[PDB]
């Protein structure tokens, strides 16, 4: 009874934290998908011609001039070049936002399943 | 009874770990304030200095970038002493309330 | 017994590169959703290292179609690799445990 | 207390660190080399060939596009020869530390 | 396994024989001492009717029930539990003979009942309403202690016993829940035993003579740390981050000097002078450089105090626990009238008497710190529980067999329930009463038959309650000897005997189950 | 039986812990969007001002950037109302139901 449950409640604590860390990773993945749409919102609205400071590399910025706001690269596949317009790019970002949400949604009751089972072992040891 | 003493000392130790995350989080930033203010003074400051952080560039000069560098370094070293005194005062307070309760 | 962990490490190393493929597997299906909308509206290139090389849309459809097929080829061998390493080690957990006892 | 086995423990650990450095430089060597052959095969000089340097791009010939990768393969391989010249130097002490336990 | 028609009754009565036989010489001053080394595998010196039952590793189910039954008697009386053991096997002896003649146990059980309430009728007849004067309380306390220990040890202890129960009459309490604190003094002779009206503190304040004579004691019973443990943690215990653990160190030394300065403000808050004293009882050790500085301020500061003393000093004297020494009025603290540091043994034992409320009286025995000190501990404990019954009742009776033959004269000769079915159980009942006077005198040398014919005649002659002198073997009148029993005690032993006799008599199968 | 109604309010407690942490972000995002608006309303020297979401920083005049940064604090101002009303609602849902649980189990 009780020595089995004291080993059992400690195992489920890792299984919560292993899944919850995977939730924390996929939020970072959909973070840049929100971030790429909001960069794209300024792009069509402003105009071509405005000066931008973009990273040449890490912590080093190169200036430049802006042209062709209605044609953008989308990085999908295994790392593949896909040229799209800016209008279809917003739809595919929000599609990937709901996709990464869907990746966390299948974990989410199972994340709560490992938490509620551990609490029930805490109750069964208490009862 | 001796259980109120030995458990209250466990309460003061857990606040030492609650003290632990906040002061060292600021302490990592003051050394970044150390390395930045030295490279700016060695390099040319006649051309205009900006302030670049994540998400915003405000077009500035050297005379507006320079004082906040010395300001934000001095504010950190005060708070890491301040956060030490407050949480260690909290460990003294919970011990005497446990001794006056269960007597 | 070192033979217990050795069959597990050879299995788990194959699983880690296999889990890499599955996010690529989904995004190989994402690009086929995006290549189907293109018929000449936007051409495609290929991002391969430090060189970005021109493609066509039919060239793109075969390209992600092959890489979809290479993932599935590495999926099926692991199903052979899963059952073999779990059954060989299960035989080893009985015999090699008796070696350390006597 | 033995100071020769103190040298013998340092010697074997220096054998291990060298061989691992060779393996990671060989995989970088083939990675650049097979990156050369794939991009030449598809679409040589038609109008222009963009080449990645960060996020800005240069348009030039197909063979010069290989040439930046060719140089780094030359720099990497000379290290691999120099790494194996240190793998050989860590073996001569290993044959000689056996006698020095008996000498001193 | 089952126990059938004859055997299930037989194992019960035969076990009641040897239980009564081994526990024979345990009641009264003829009652010999007993040791257990088979109850816990330790050198143990033990005497009571209940305590000997609880220590022995008994497996017979009857003696296990009697240990439960006499527990209810031991909660009220104490001694008298060894009185109950003697009458049970004697009661089972006579009725079994009728069953050995062939008779239902239930008709004898039917005869056990009406025989009992005639004796219960006789207890109101034989009760002797005496005063609860101290010398009358001495005679109860003499026979209670001489049952368990020597008489020379008893009379020294009897002086300390009868004065504390007069102090609980100041609280108008008929019972004894407090004034029962047995404190033990390191000695080599248990011939000495001191009575302190207040309390006894068992410590001596490492730098001595801080203030050893305190005429105005304002007591603070606290447990404040002055030798504070200083830890650096990042995980709840010692961790590997050397960068993190360093910053907590500067606040650790600020706690010790914090508690030293709080003592100074409290002394001027309570006293205002050094003519009025102030006593700090710390449950923990105190810094000796603080014990030097507190001694000059007019403070005695006792250290490492026992946690059992921590509550009882709050009850009689007062003083609540803190972890600070903040400015407190004398209303928040208690008072003691006199504090004196006494020394006997390797420890100083500070006496603290004449409390804010003298509600608990400390019984300080001395002794060689042996099981003899344990043997005098429960002896005075049962000494206090016996005279607890004396404050309960109004009628203190000459006991030791004086009532026992006096009941059996009325029971046998006068049939209460003249119908012959119940008088059979009367005959077993009245012969059960004889076992206490007859065999202890027979143990003393004058055998049981010379004792019975003497005390039956003399009580029928006089009506004065002649008992039995347990040191000669012949009946002497217990009214002048001072071997007395309470009206509260003698009812329950009649009560506890009968109910536990009938149910084990009325079994026919003892089956293994569970 | 009675075990199932225990677990429902316990699962409601962890939804409050999710509700408690959302208001700490949205209060911070309002004030920080207000804080960056103050530093650009501080200067009068230069109308040059860069805005961006990624590591791009487009060249625009500062005055149109103010009114957009006026909208940035405002949407974060709008969300702290709907969350705190929600956070109180989930608090009232679990705590008032918790009054039902313990007093009738201990009964």
Swiss-Prot record, chain B:
One of its GO terms (biological process) is negative regulation of amyloid fibril formation. It is found in: Nucleus; Cytoplasm; Mitochondrion. Keywords: Chaperone, Cytoplasm, Mitochondrion, Nucleus. GO terms for molecular function: amyloid-beta binding; protein folding chaperone; unfolded protein binding. Disulfide bonds: none annotated. Its main location: nucleus. GO terms for cellular component: cytoplasm; cytosol; mitochondrion; nucleoplasm; nucleus; prefoldin complex; protein folding chaperone complex; RPAP3/R2TP/prefoldin-like complex. Coiled coil: none annotated. Heterohexamer of two PFD-alpha type and four PFD-beta type subunits. Component of the PAQosome complex which is responsible for the biogenesis of several protein complexes and which consists of R2TP complex members RUVBL1, RUVBL2, RPAP3 and PIH1D1, URI complex members PFDN2, PFDN6, PDRG1, UXT and URI1 as well as ASDURF, POLR2E and DNAAF10/WDR92. Interacts with URI1; the interaction is phosphorylation-dependent and occurs in a growth-dependent manner. Binds specifically to cytosolic chaperonin (c-CPN) and transfers target proteins to it. Binds to nascent polypeptide chain and promotes folding in an environment in which there are many competing pathways for nonnative proteins. Belongs to the prefoldin subunit beta family. This is Prefoldin subunit 2. It comes from Homo sapiens.
Curated annotation (Swiss-Prot), chain C:
The keyword Chaperone applies. The keyword Ubl conjugation applies. GO terms for molecular function: amyloid-beta binding; protein-folding chaperone binding; unfolded protein binding. GO terms for biological process: chaperone-mediated protein complex assembly; chaperone-mediated protein folding; negative regulation of amyloid fibril formation; protein folding; protein stabilization. There is a cross-link at residue 54 (Glycyl lysine isopeptide (Lys-Gly) (interchain with G-Cter in SUMO2)). Transmembrane segments: none annotated. Belongs to the prefoldin subunit beta family. Binds specifically to cytosolic chaperonin (c-CPN) and transfers target proteins to it. Binds to nascent polypeptide chain and promotes folding in an environment in which there are many competing pathways for nonnative proteins. This is Prefoldin subunit 6. It comes from Homo sapiens (Human). The chain holds residues 13 to 114 of 129 of the full protein.
UniProtKB/Swiss-Prot annotation, chain D:
Belongs to the prefoldin subunit beta family. Binds specifically to cytosolic chaperonin (c-CPN) and transfers target proteins to it. Binds to nascent polypeptide chain and promotes folding in an environment in which there are many competing pathways for nonnative proteins. Transmembrane segments: none annotated. Keywords: Acetylation, Chaperone, Cytoplasm, Mitochondrion, Nucleus, Phosphoprotein. It comes from Homo sapiens (Human). The keyword Transport does not apply. GO terms for molecular function: amyloid-beta binding; protein-folding chaperone binding; unfolded protein binding. One of its GO terms (biological process) is protein folding. GO terms for cellular component: cytoplasm; cytosol; mitochondrion; nucleus; prefoldin complex. Heterohexamer of two PFD-alpha type and four PFD-beta type subunits. Interacts with URI1; the interaction is phosphorylation-dependent and occurs in a growth-dependent manner. The gene is PFDN4. Its main location: nucleus. It is found in: Nucleus; Cytoplasm; Mitochondrion. This is Prefoldin subunit 4.
Swiss-Prot record, chain F:
One of its GO terms (cellular component) is prefoldin complex. It comes from the Eukaryota. One of its GO terms (biological process) is negative regulation of amyloid fibril formation. Binds specifically to cytosolic chaperonin (c-CPN) and transfers target proteins to it. Binds to nascent polypeptide chain and promotes folding in an environment in which there are many competing pathways for nonnative proteins. Keywords: Acetylation, Chaperone. The keyword Acetylation applies. Heterohexamer of two PFD-alpha type and four PFD-beta type subunits. Belongs to the prefoldin subunit beta family. The keyword Acetylation applies. One of its GO terms (molecular function) is protein folding chaperone. This is Prefoldin subunit 1. Pfam families: Prefoldin_2 (PF01920). Coiled coil: none annotated. InterPro entries: PFD_beta-like (IPR002777), Prefoldin (IPR009053). It comes from Homo sapiens.
């Amino acid at each position: 009874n009780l020595p089995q449950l004291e080993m059992l409640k400690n195992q489920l604590d890792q299984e919560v934290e292993f899944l919850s860390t995977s939730i924390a990773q996929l939020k970072v993945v959909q973070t840049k998908y929100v971030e790429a749409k909001d960069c794209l919102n300024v792009l069509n609205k402003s105009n071509e011609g405005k000066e931008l400071l973009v990273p040449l590399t890490s912590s080093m910025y190169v200036p430049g001039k802006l042209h062709d706001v209605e044609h953008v690269l989308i990085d999908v596949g295994t790392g593949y070049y896909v040229e799209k317009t800016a209008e279809d790019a917003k739809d595919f970002f929000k599609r990937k936002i709901d996709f990464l949400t869907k990746q966390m949604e299948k974990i989410q009751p199972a994340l709560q399943e490992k938490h509620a089972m551990k609490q029930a072992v805490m109750e069964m040891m208490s009862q | 009874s001796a259980e109120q003493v030995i458990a209250g000392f466990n309460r003061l130790r857990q606040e030492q770990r609650g003290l632990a995350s906040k002061a060292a989080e600021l302490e990592m930033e003051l050394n970044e304030h150390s390395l930045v203010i030295d490279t700016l003074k060695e390099v040319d400051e006649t051309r205009k200095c900006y302030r670049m952080v994540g998400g915003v560039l405000v077009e500035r000069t050297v005379k507006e970038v320079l004082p906040a560098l010395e300001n934000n370094k001095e504010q950190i070293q005060k708070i890491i002493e301040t956060l030490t005194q407050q949480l260690q005062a909290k460990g003294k307070e919970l011990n005497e309330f446990r001794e006056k309760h269960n007597i | 017994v070192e033979k217990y962990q050795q069959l597990q490490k050879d299995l788990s190393k194959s699983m880690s590169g296999r889990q890499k493929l599955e996010a690529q597997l989904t995004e190989n299906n994402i690009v086929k959703e995006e290549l189907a909308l293109l018929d000449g509206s936007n051409v495609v290139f290929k991002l391969l290292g430090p060189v970005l090389v021109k493609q066509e849309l039919g060239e793109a459809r075969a390209t992600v179609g092959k890489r979809l097929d290479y993932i599935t080829a590495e999926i099926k061998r692991y199903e052979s690799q899963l059952r073999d390493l779990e059954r060989q080690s299960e035989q080893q957990r009985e015999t090699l445990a008796q070696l350390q006892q006597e | 207390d033995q100071q020769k086995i103190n040298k013998f423990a340092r010697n074997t650990s220096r054998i291990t660190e060298l061989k691992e450095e060779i393996e990671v430089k060989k995989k970088q060597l083939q990675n650049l080399e097979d990156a050369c052959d794939d991009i030449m095969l598809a679409d040589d000089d038609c109008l222009m060939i963009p080449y990645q340097i960060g996020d800005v791009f240069i348009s030039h010939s197909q063979e010069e596009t290989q040439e930046m990768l060719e140089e780094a393969k030359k720099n990497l391989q000379e290290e691999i020869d120099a790494l194996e010249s240190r793998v050989e130097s860590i073996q001569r002490v290993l044959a000689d530390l056996k006698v020095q336990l008996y000498a001193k | 396994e089952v126990a059938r028609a004859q055997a299930a009754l037989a194992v019960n009565i035969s076990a009641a024989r040897g239980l009564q036989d081994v526990l024979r010489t345990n009641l009264g001053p003829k009652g010999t001492m007993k040791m257990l080394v088979s109850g816990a595998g330790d050198i143990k010196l033990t005497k009571d009717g209940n305590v000997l039952l609880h220590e022995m590793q008994i497996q017979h189910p009857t003696a296990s029930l009697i240990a439960k039954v006499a527990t209810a008697q031991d909660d009220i009386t104490g001694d008298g539990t060894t009185s109950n053991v003697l009458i049970i096997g004697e009661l089972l002896k006579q009725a079994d003979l009728y069953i050995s003649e062939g008779l239902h146990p239930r008709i004898i059980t039917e005869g056990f009942e009406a025989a009992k309430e005639k004796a219960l009728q006789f207890l109101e007849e034989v009760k002797v309403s005496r005063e609860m004067d101290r010398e009358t309380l001495i005679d109860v306390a003499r026979t209670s202690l001489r049952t368990k220990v020597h008489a020379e040890l008893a009379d020294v202890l009897t002086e300390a016993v009868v004065d504390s129960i007069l102090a609980i009459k100041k609280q108008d309490e008929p019972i004894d829940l407090f004034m029962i604190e047995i404190m033990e003094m390191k000695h080599k002779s248990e011939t000495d035993t001191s009575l302190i009206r207040g309390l006894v503190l068992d410590h001596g304040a490492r730098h001595p003579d801080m203030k050893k004579r305190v005429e105005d004691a304002y007591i603070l019973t606290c447990n404040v740390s002055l030798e504070y443990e200083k830890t650096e943690v990042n995980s709840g215990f010692f961790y590997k981050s050397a960068e993190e653990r360093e910053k907590l160190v500067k606040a650790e030394r600020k706690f010790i000097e914090d508690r030293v300065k709080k003592i100074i403000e409290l002394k001027r808050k309570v006293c205002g002078d050094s003519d009025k004293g102030f006593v700090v009882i710390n449950q923990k050790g105190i810094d000796p450089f603080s014990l030097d500085a507190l001694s000059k301020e007019g403070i005695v500061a006792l250290r490492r105090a026992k946690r059992r003393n921590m509550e009882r000093l709050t009850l009689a004297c007062g003083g609540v626990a803190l972890n600070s020494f903040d400015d407190l009025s004398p209303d928040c603290l208690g008072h003691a009238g006199l504090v004196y540091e006494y020394t006997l043994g390797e420890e100083k034992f500070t006496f603290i008497e004449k409390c804010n409320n003298p509600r608990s009286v400390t019984l300080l025995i001395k002794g060689p710190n042996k099981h003899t000190l344990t043997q005098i501990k429960d002896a005075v404990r049962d000494g206090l529980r016996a005279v607890k019954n004396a404050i309960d009742d109004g009628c203190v009776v000459p006991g030791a067999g004086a009532v026992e033959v006096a009941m059996a004269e009325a029971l046998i000769k006068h049939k209460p329930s003249v119908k012959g079915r119940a008088q059979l159980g009367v005959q077993a009942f009245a012969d059960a009463l004889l076992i206490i006077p007859k065999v202890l005198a027979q143990n003393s040398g004058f055998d049981l038959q010379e004792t019975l014919v003497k005390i039956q005649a003399e009580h029928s002659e006089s009506g004065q309650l002649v008992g039995v002198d347990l040191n000669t073997g012949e009946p002497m009148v217990a009214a002048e000897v001072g071997v007395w029993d309470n009206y509260c005690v003698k009812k329950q032993l009649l009560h506890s005997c009968t109910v536990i006799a009938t149910n084990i008599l009325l079994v026919d199968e003892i089956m293994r189950a569970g | 039986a009675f075990t199932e109604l225990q677990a429902k309010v316990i699962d409601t407690q962890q939804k409050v812990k999710l509700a408690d942490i959302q208001i700490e972000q949205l209060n911070r995002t309002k004030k920080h969007a207000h804080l960056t608006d103050t530093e650009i309303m501080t200067l009068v020297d230069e109308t040059n001002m860069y805005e961006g979401v990624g590591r791009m920083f487009i060249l625009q005049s500062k005055e149109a950037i103010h009114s957009q940064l006026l909208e940035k604090q405002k949407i974060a101002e709008e969300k702290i109302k709907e969350l705190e009303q929600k956070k109180s609602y989930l608090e009232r849902s679990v705590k008032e139901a918790e009054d039902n649980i313990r007093e009738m189990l201990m009964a």
